[PDB]
């Protein structure tokens, strides 16, 4: 909203024609100022009248508007991703609902919002898993693909997690397999790569495919190190530990993987994840 006027200030100042000369077009001096502050978005025609006085090419304001809108939206995705990581779903639900409430036409961004809405509903208990999955699949079979090639895969990752955590381990696995297959093809966005491999390994672990699980976990660690990310690495070492214990590797290599998990937990002040860990080492 406020960039249009801000770039109108920048330019009219450098043009060399007065702010009250830009008044005598189609509006009071006031409207120019209210536009100047972003307060009022100018009407299509008034703007075209202003487009006569600072030079200037017309597509330069649309240019302006498009960067400001992509940044607006990118900033919102960033913010939403940020609360997901913090598990703040009541806030996610509210935020995305309010954005959808505007019902503005932008199919890909609306898909992003709905994905987040249905998942948050799910976490918040507003909706069954069966229902959440349905809704999520209606998204895949819009079969869109804008600027974000990964968005369907993200939506697929959610579908597989809900299945896996609700007992449907073979469906979830097949799905994780689909995703990895589409990632080998695309690229790159390796944090996600790591994340699907982490869930895949969990589901493999609960299906007693321990080597398979361990393979996937080593691979995810390897990727975590190549993109420099500690996002899931501590829990990758936790999972590595669990696999090496069900496969009965030397206590040494087992406890090793676990101290490392422990290191990341403290380093990352991940107190929930840290708790369980100190439990097991005595317990099991």
């Amino acid at each position: 909203a406020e960039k249009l006027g801000s770039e109108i200030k920048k330019i009219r100042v450098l043009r060399g024609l007065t702010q009250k000369q830009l008044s005598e077009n189609i509006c009071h001096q006031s409207e120019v100022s209210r536009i100047e502050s972003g307060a009022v978005y100018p009407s299509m025609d008034i703007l075209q009248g202003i487009a006569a006085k600072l030079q200037i090419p017309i597509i330069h304001f649309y240019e302006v508007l498009i960067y400001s809108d992509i940044e607006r939206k990118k900033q919102f995705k960033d913010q939403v991703i940020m609360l997901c990581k913090q598990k703040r779903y009541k806030e996610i639900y509210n935020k995305v609902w309010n954005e959808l409430k505007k019902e503005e036409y932008h199919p890909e961004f609306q898909q992003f919002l709905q994905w987040q809405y249905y998942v948050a509903a799910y976490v918040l208990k507003k909706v069954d898993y069966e229902y959440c999955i349905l809704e999520l699949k209606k998204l895949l079979n819009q079969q869109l693909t804008g600027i974000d090639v990964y968005q369907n895969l993200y939506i697929e990752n959610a579908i597989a997690n809900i299945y896996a955590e609700n007992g449907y381990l073979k469906k979830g696995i097949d799905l994780f397999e689909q995703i990895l297959k589409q990632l080998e093809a695309l690229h790159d966005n390796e944090e996600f790569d790591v994340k699907v491999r982490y869930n895949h390994a969990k589901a493999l672990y609960l299906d007693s495919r321990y080597e398979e699980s361990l393979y996937q976990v080593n691979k995810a660690i390897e990727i975590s190190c190549r993109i420099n990310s500690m996002a899931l690495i501590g829990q990758l070492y936790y999972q590595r530990g669990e696999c090496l214990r069900k496969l009965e590797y030397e206590e040494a290599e087992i406890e090793d993987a676990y101290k490392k998990a422990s290191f990341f937990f403290d380093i990352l002040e991940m107190h929930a994840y840290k708790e369980a860990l100190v439990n097991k080492i005595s317990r099991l």
Binding site: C84, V119, N161, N199, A203
Partner: peptide, 5 residues
């Protein structure tokens, strides 16, 4: 631990 969204 939990699955990761």
């Amino acid at each position: 631990l939990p699955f990761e969204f």
